[PDB]
Ligand SMILES: *C/C=C(C)/C=C/C=C(C)/C=C/C1=C(C)CCCC1(C)C
């Protein structure tokens with residue numbers, strides 16, 4: 001059972017992580033150019049099975065604001081969890097091997113991140129981006145249901161596996177777009193885009209490995225709070241890695 | 257818990273009857289349908305992120321008759337499996353626990369084929385849009401499975417159900433965006449039969465959701481789990497025949 005001292009230490013760790021997210025949010029808000037990525041519709045110009053209009057831009061993602069949004073969401077939920085007011089509810093949740101505020105945050109923050117990665121790869125169709133957001137949110141909600149209905153060592157990973165099925169779909173989409181079957185242009189995917197997809201695919205898999213390790217509950221992973229710390233570190237590293245790779249690639253003032 | 261021989265034999269034959277209706281429609285569509293196809297496209301960057309795209313390219317084509325036969329055939333197959341041998345014993349045992357895993361395994365494939373076809377009929381073609389629609393629709397079904405796995409009727413817990421509604425509505429928001437066609441240079445003339453498909457199947461999809469809601473509320477006649485089991489079998493039969501013959505009438509008749 002987690003002790004009062006262990007829970008209080010974790011709340012301090014949440015606060016520190018929140019400060020790192022918040023200061024990066026500020027730096028991106030302040031320093032980023034107005035670089036935008038399109039969401040498009042490619043409408044039928046006739047009955048189904050005939051021809052299409054050219055893609056039209058429906059709206060544009062303000063990329064700096066979107067990066068600031070996923071950093072800011074992490075900061076907000078870390079500050080909420082860190083609060084003395086939430087000590088009773090955190091302790092109650094951690095005693096049931098649950099952190100629900102993590103899933104509420106990730107359902108929005110990780111979904112913003114995967115949409116931005118898709119747009120950076122050139123995925124623009126508004127339904128592609130909407131459905132990527134939804135299936136990524138679904139991945140998180142399956143992880144939430146793993147925590148709600150199972151305990152470590154109980155032999156039940158069904159929600160986890162459903163989360164893996166939902167979770168892999170956006171990444172199959174990215175892989176299709178970088179392979180670009182049927183593509184005409186000899187223009188190559190930029191290095192920095194490969195860097196984003198490869199690094200963030202590794203991090204996304206890392207989150208899945210934490211829930212797997214926690215619910216397997218073997219060796220040091222018998223201690224649920226080890227997973228709780230791992231999630232805080234992985235969110236910090238993943239969101240910083242994506243923020244600064246996008247910033248370096250697209251948001252610098254030489255590109256304004 | 258054990259069912260009466262009369263109860264479980266009655267459901268066995270209900271499955272067989274539904275299966276025969278699906279199977280005969282599958283044959284009629286396979287035999288009679290033309291070679292009408294709908295594209296899946298890639299619209300690749302032909303420059304750096306935030307610049308220009310190639311014209312959309314067709315990566316592959318959905319053979320619409322075959323895809324309609326597929327969703328009918330999946331329903332037929334699962335109805336025959338559920339009424340057969342050792343699978344029938346598992347089906348009976350699961351019904352006694354207020355579960356039908358066979359239903360969710362089938363629907364995760366059959367309803368996902370259906371919503372992708374509806375998306376393509378509306379002119380959604382981007383291969384990642386269609387992949388992510390398939391994934392988020394599958395997710396909706398898997399949330400319905402987790403509602404049955406972890407909760408009991410009347411227990412007041414609908415969290416997996418609500419998660420299923422969040423995932424489930426995403427493709428339909430996509431369809432609505434495409435028929436409104438925001439940013440279109442000219443008004444988009446969507447055929448009547450396409451509106452028929454979207455409106456009718458939206459009503460049917462909401463009907464499936466209402467059955468699970470009514471079962472887990474468990475009030476009045478819905479306290480009997482098997483009443484919901486019968487409602488699902490009827491809705492699957494009516495929804496799939498409605499979509500099959502609307503697509504057939506709209507697209508599959510004339511020789512190409
Ligand atoms: C900023 C926070 C991020 C990037 C969080 C990402 C979280 C995931 C990629 C979670 C993945 C999971 C699965 C693939 C299976 C179910 C368990 C999850 C939710 C941990």
Ligand SMILES: *C/C=C(C)/C=C/C=C(C)/C=C/C1=C(C)CCCC1(C)C
Nearest residue numbers: 367397400420421424461464465468
């Ligand atoms: C041929 C089979 C079909 C069309 C089945 C469709 C099923 C659904 C639309 C199910 C929807 C559900 C929700 C929206 C919430 C959770 C419960 C479900 C799975 C019944």
